[PDB]
Scaffold this active site. Structure first.
Site, PDB file in Angstrom:
ATOM      1  N   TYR B  67       0.809  -1.236   0.000  1.00 38.97           N
ATOM      2  CA  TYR B  67       0.000   0.000   0.000  1.00 38.97           C
ATOM      3  C   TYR B  67       0.834   1.274   0.000  1.00 38.97           C
ATOM      4  O   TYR B  67       0.281   2.367  -0.157  1.00 38.97           O
ATOM      5  CB  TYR B  67      -0.982   0.027   1.172  1.00 38.97           C
ATOM      6  CG  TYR B  67      -2.210  -0.840   1.000  1.00 38.97           C
ATOM      7  CD1 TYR B  67      -3.478  -0.292   1.073  1.00 38.97           C
ATOM      8  CD2 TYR B  67      -2.103  -2.224   0.760  1.00 38.97           C
ATOM      9  CE1 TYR B  67      -4.612  -1.086   0.918  1.00 38.97           C
ATOM     10  CE2 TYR B  67      -3.222  -3.019   0.606  1.00 38.97           C
ATOM     11  CZ  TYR B  67      -4.479  -2.449   0.684  1.00 38.97           C
ATOM     12  OH  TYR B  67      -5.611  -3.245   0.527  1.00 38.97           O
ATOM     13  N   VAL B 148      -5.482   4.887   2.969  1.00 37.69           N
ATOM     14  CA  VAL B 148      -4.530   5.392   1.968  1.00 37.69           C
ATOM     15  C   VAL B 148      -4.927   5.109   0.526  1.00 37.69           C
ATOM     16  O   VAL B 148      -4.459   5.801  -0.380  1.00 37.69           O
ATOM     17  CB  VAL B 148      -3.115   4.842   2.240  1.00 37.69           C
ATOM     18  CG1 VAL B 148      -2.973   3.399   1.800  1.00 37.69           C
ATOM     19  CG2 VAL B 148      -2.046   5.740   1.607  1.00 37.69           C
ATOM     20  N   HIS B 169     -20.953   5.176   5.595  1.00 37.85           N
ATOM     21  CA  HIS B 169     -20.418   4.235   4.611  1.00 37.85           C
ATOM     22  C   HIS B 169     -21.206   4.396   3.309  1.00 37.85           C
ATOM     23  O   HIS B 169     -22.425   4.442   3.336  1.00 37.85           O
ATOM     24  CB  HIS B 169     -20.562   2.836   5.159  1.00 37.85           C
ATOM     25  CG  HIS B 169     -19.805   1.789   4.418  1.00 37.85           C
ATOM     26  ND1 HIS B 169     -20.046   1.476   3.104  1.00 37.85           N
ATOM     27  CD2 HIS B 169     -18.865   0.919   4.844  1.00 37.85           C
ATOM     28  CE1 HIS B 169     -19.262   0.488   2.732  1.00 37.85           C
ATOM     29  NE2 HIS B 169     -18.546   0.116   3.779  1.00 37.85           N
ATOM     30  N   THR B 181     -24.061  -4.352   8.311  1.00 36.92           N
ATOM     31  CA  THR B 181     -23.135  -5.458   8.615  1.00 36.92           C
ATOM     32  C   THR B 181     -22.373  -5.252   9.925  1.00 36.92           C
ATOM     33  O   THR B 181     -21.161  -5.464  10.011  1.00 36.92           O
ATOM     34  CB  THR B 181     -22.162  -5.691   7.448  1.00 36.92           C
ATOM     35  OG1 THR B 181     -21.396  -4.497   7.216  1.00 36.92           O
ATOM     36  CG2 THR B 181     -22.930  -6.007   6.190  1.00 36.92           C
ATOM     37  N   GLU B 239     -13.558  -1.735  11.967  1.00 35.32           N
ATOM     38  CA  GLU B 239     -14.813  -1.062  11.604  1.00 35.32           C
ATOM     39  C   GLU B 239     -15.988  -1.504  12.458  1.00 35.32           C
ATOM     40  O   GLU B 239     -16.862  -0.687  12.803  1.00 35.32           O
ATOM     41  CB  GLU B 239     -15.128  -1.274  10.131  1.00 35.32           C
ATOM     42  CG  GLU B 239     -16.436  -0.674   9.645  1.00 35.32           C
ATOM     43  CD  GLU B 239     -16.509  -0.734   8.149  1.00 35.32           C
ATOM     44  OE1 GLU B 239     -17.101  -1.695   7.611  1.00 35.32           O
ATOM     45  OE2 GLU B 239     -15.921   0.145   7.500  1.00 35.32           O
ATOM     46  N   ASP B 262     -17.031   5.515  -3.599  1.00 40.14           N
ATOM     47  CA  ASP B 262     -16.399   4.667  -4.605  1.00 40.14           C
ATOM     48  C   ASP B 262     -17.209   4.831  -5.887  1.00 40.14           C
ATOM     49  O   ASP B 262     -18.321   4.272  -5.992  1.00 40.14           O
ATOM     50  CB  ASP B 262     -16.358   3.211  -4.136  1.00 40.14           C
ATOM     51  CG  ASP B 262     -15.619   2.293  -5.119  1.00 40.14           C
ATOM     52  OD1 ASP B 262     -15.584   2.652  -6.311  1.00 40.14           O
ATOM     53  OD2 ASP B 262     -15.085   1.255  -4.677  1.00 40.14           O
TER      54      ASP B 262
HETATM   55  O1  LIG Z   1      -1.631  -4.524   3.338  1.00 37.64           O
HETATM   56  C1  LIG Z   1      -2.177  -3.493   3.821  1.00 37.64           C
HETATM   57  C2  LIG Z   1      -3.519  -3.540   4.141  1.00 37.64           C
HETATM   58  C3  LIG Z   1      -4.097  -2.405   4.684  1.00 37.64           C
HETATM   59  N1  LIG Z   1      -3.375  -1.281   4.893  1.00 37.64           N
HETATM   60  C4  LIG Z   1      -3.929  -0.064   5.479  1.00 37.64           C
HETATM   61  O2  LIG Z   1      -5.230  -0.338   6.022  1.00 37.64           O
HETATM   62  C5  LIG Z   1      -6.227   0.386   5.294  1.00 37.64           C
HETATM   63  C6  LIG Z   1      -7.521  -0.408   5.232  1.00 37.64           C
HETATM   64  O3  LIG Z   1      -7.379  -1.509   4.340  1.00 37.64           O
HETATM   65  P1  LIG Z   1      -8.098  -1.552   2.945  1.00 37.64           P
HETATM   66  O4  LIG Z   1      -8.032  -0.192   2.301  1.00 37.64           O
HETATM   67  O5  LIG Z   1      -7.523  -2.731   2.207  1.00 37.64           O
HETATM   68  O6  LIG Z   1      -9.587  -2.012   3.347  1.00 37.64           O
HETATM   69  P2  LIG Z   1     -11.049  -1.440   2.934  1.00 37.64           P
HETATM   70  O7  LIG Z   1     -11.858  -2.580   2.444  1.00 37.64           O
HETATM   71  O8  LIG Z   1     -10.943  -0.242   1.911  1.00 37.64           O
HETATM   72  C7  LIG Z   1     -11.654  -0.866   4.527  1.00 37.64           C
HETATM   73  C8  LIG Z   1     -12.402  -1.947   5.333  1.00 37.64           C
HETATM   74  O9  LIG Z   1     -11.814  -3.289   5.332  1.00 37.64           O
HETATM   75  C9  LIG Z   1     -10.779  -3.633   6.254  1.00 37.64           C
HETATM   76  C10 LIG Z   1     -10.430  -5.110   6.100  1.00 37.64           C
HETATM   77  O10 LIG Z   1      -9.803  -5.277   4.824  1.00 37.64           O
HETATM   78  C11 LIG Z   1     -11.219  -3.366   7.672  1.00 37.64           C
HETATM   79  O11 LIG Z   1     -12.313  -4.254   7.995  1.00 37.64           O
HETATM   80  C12 LIG Z   1     -11.610  -1.892   7.764  1.00 37.64           C
HETATM   81  O12 LIG Z   1     -11.955  -1.736   9.127  1.00 37.64           O
HETATM   82  C13 LIG Z   1     -12.752  -1.530   6.777  1.00 37.64           C
HETATM   83  O13 LIG Z   1     -13.166  -0.144   6.761  1.00 37.64           O
HETATM   84  C14 LIG Z   1      -5.546   0.732   3.970  1.00 37.64           C
HETATM   85  O14 LIG Z   1      -6.119   1.861   3.294  1.00 37.64           O
HETATM   86  C15 LIG Z   1      -4.147   1.014   4.423  1.00 37.64           C
HETATM   87  O15 LIG Z   1      -4.045   2.310   5.021  1.00 37.64           O
HETATM   88  C16 LIG Z   1      -2.011  -1.271   4.572  1.00 37.64           C
HETATM   89  O16 LIG Z   1      -1.337  -0.239   4.764  1.00 37.64           O
HETATM   90  N2  LIG Z   1      -1.461  -2.375   4.039  1.00 37.64           N
END
Ligand SMILES: O=c1ccn([C@@H]2O[C@H](COP(=O)(O)OP(=O)(O)C[C@H]3O[C@H](CO)[C@H](O)[C@H](O)[C@H]3O)[C@@H](O)[C@H]2O)c(=O)[nH]1
Ligand SMILES: O=c1ccn([C@@H]2O[C@H](COP(=O)(O)OP(=O)(O)C[C@H]3O[C@H](CO)[C@H](O)[C@H](O)[C@H]3O)[C@@H](O)[C@H]2O)c(=O)[nH]1
Ligand SMILES: CCCCCCCCO[C@@H]1O[C@H](CO)[C@H](O)C[C@H]1O[C@@H]1O[C@@H](C)[C@@H](O)[C@@H](O)[C@@H]1O
Ligand SMILES: CCCCCCCCO[C@@H]1O[C@H](CO)[C@H](O)C[C@H]1O[C@@H]1O[C@@H](C)[C@@H](O)[C@@H](O)[C@@H]1O
Ligand SMILES: [Mn+2]
Ligand SMILES: [Mn+2]
Lengths: 282, 282
Positions: B67, B148, B169, B181, B239, B262
């Protein structure tokens, strides 16, 4: 600031993002302060939040000369409708302590009679800010400052509480700003030009945290003293100054005219679902 | 709390009590928190208020493993759209400090690279609450905590700032609470029954004062540790816990889905006048 414990489980209707509470009125100011109307708040949620903080509300009211006659109805109706279930401290400023009626209070509520000298236009702002500063800070969390020539007819509760609030004047809520009766002479500290102004707030109902109310009343008192030294009295006295203050220091909630109404003068328009605090003939 | 000097004279359109800003959406929650949509705020008034306090906003973002690829667009678009004119401190948590792109910042803005160990589900809540407590309290007034894998496309500014906020959301703002959820197993600290819930907040954008954000992240981290000890992981990880926290500790503003969208998944519906902060393909 202060640590807030969790709310308990509660069962209530889900707020729906694609369904407004009210479509007929403005419910938030352009500086993101709620405008408090019936239908905009769940009082059960708010009561929980404020009871969990053991909130104490002070209410100031002045009854000087003949206006002592208004105290019985004012206080008896406050007991029915004002902050019921919360801690309340009434502060009755009067030149006639013996004319204060004996009113039976609910539990957790108290009344103090504060004698003032007879007679001035500056008295309320001066008294709230110069004389009572220390006492209010020790005794209450919020101060609510109202006229006495009034009665409560419906719920007035913790939905109004916020660091600083004013109330929309019932005669001007539909008016354009050029029509507002702001002080218009640039020689007055209360001066507001014709192209400025959000709302016309009535001097008869304002409040906030003790700190913010002392700030407002101190500022208004100082500005009124400047005007006196300069041989000018603002058109609507302390109300003119209150309006200048709230223009320059935006309130964090605004109360709708539900909270300050005159039914003999203005009836019961469709936009008001409740008449909460209303003028008594004077 | 802090002393606020007067706003200067400003010329802007008068808010009209009998004209709502938005009739198509809920603009205030039942606990009197503004829901931030385009058309509800005058940004000139808000910018004045927050600049007069010399407000500093911290923005936390995690870029671990692959990321780090998202940082260049994230930061370059933040420079165009996030809190422009205000003091900003970015805190980039990464396992690869050398992979952080060199991004040119506007005046009054700074970036700190904070190295973390490689790899967890608890990492963001733990890091914001256990490791950075003292630094954030000394350096910034508000913290904003975001994903990010995102870009800024339009204004994200001081209209969001408040003691505690969450963001609706984008997939659930029209959903009934039974469809949310939330974690539904009573063995989890994040459990919310089917008859509870105001909104489904996304974990990808929350914030508030430093004190309130540390409270939230501490509580969520502690609850996640309890779940780990009990051999359960909430359905949506941090979350799920964020949702439980914001159910029990109501936010003082709620951001509309303008702030977390999105477009590939959900298009550009009529209710969104702006797409401010949007998903990038991952
Ligand atoms: O390898 C990684 C994985 C994550 N991250 C960091 O964590 C953030 C959230 O993950 P992501 O965007 O994949 O999930 P989304 O599906 O967009 C965000 C959602 O899903 C998550 C699980 O994947 C959690 O459940 C979260 O709480 C929920 O909002 C990502 O923006 C990075 O800042 C990183 O730096 N390296
Ligand atoms: O002899 C008195 C006179 C006043 N008072 C006290 O002052 C309050 C305001 O006065 P009033 O209600 O007449 O004015 P309204 O027209 O309802 C209120 C308005 O007009 C005022 C001048 O009369 C000011 O301009 C004020 O700022 C404005 O809001 C009254 O409720 C009493 O608590 C008292 O105790 N004894
Ligand atoms: C008959 C009186 C007409 C009053 C209409 C406008 O109200 C007055 O507005 C002034 C500012 O322009 C100032 O606030 C006094 C206010 O009059 C008071 O409030 C009214 C709603 C009435 O209750 C009136 O009797 C009272 O004096
Ligand atoms: C194709 C993926 C469908 C995702 C729809 C719902 O969004 C997901 O909601 C989950 C909670 O039920 C959790 O918040 C993850 C969230 O998915 C994220 O956010 C979406 C808007 C997409 O950007 C998706 O790619 C991302 O993983
Ligand atoms: Mn009166
Ligand atoms: Mn993401």
């Amino acid at each position: 600031g202060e640590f807030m414990v969790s709310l308990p489980r509660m069962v209530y209707p889900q707020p729906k993002v694609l369904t407004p509470c009210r479509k007929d009125v403005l419910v938030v100011t352009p500086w993101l302060a709620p405008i408090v109307w019936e239908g905009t708040f769940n009082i059960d949620i708010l009561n929980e939040q404020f009871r969990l903080q053991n909130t104490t509300i002070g209410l100031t009211v002045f009854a000087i000369k003949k206006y002592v006659a208004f105290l019985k109805l004012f206080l008896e109706t406050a007991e029915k409708h004002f902050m019921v279930g919360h801690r309340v401290h009434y502060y009755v400023f009067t030149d006639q302590p013996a004319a204060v009626p004996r009113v039976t209070l609910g539990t957790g509520r108290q009344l103090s009679v504060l004698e003032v000298g007879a007679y001035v236009s500056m008295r309320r702002m001066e008294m709230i800010s110069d004389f009572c500063e220390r006492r209010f800070l020790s005794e209450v969390d919020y101060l609510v400052c109202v006229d006495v020539d009034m009665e409560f007819r419906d719920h007035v509760g913790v939905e109004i509480l916020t660091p600083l609030f004013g109330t929309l004047h019932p005669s001007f809520y539909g008016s354009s700003r050029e029509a507002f009766t702001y002080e218009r002479r640039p020689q007055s500290q209360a001066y507001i030009p014709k192209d400025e102004g959000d709302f016309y707030y009535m001097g008869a109902f304002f409040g906030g945290s003790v700190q913010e109310v002392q700030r407002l009343t101190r500022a208004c008192h100082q500005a009124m003293m400047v005007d006196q030294a300069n041989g000018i009295e603002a058109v609507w006295h302390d109300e003119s100054h209150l309006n200048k203050y709230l223009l320059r220091h935006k309130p964090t909630k605004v109360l709708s005219p539900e909270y300050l109404w005159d039914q003999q003068l203005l009836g019961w328009p469709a936009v008001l679902r409740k008449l909460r605090f209303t003028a008594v003939p004077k």
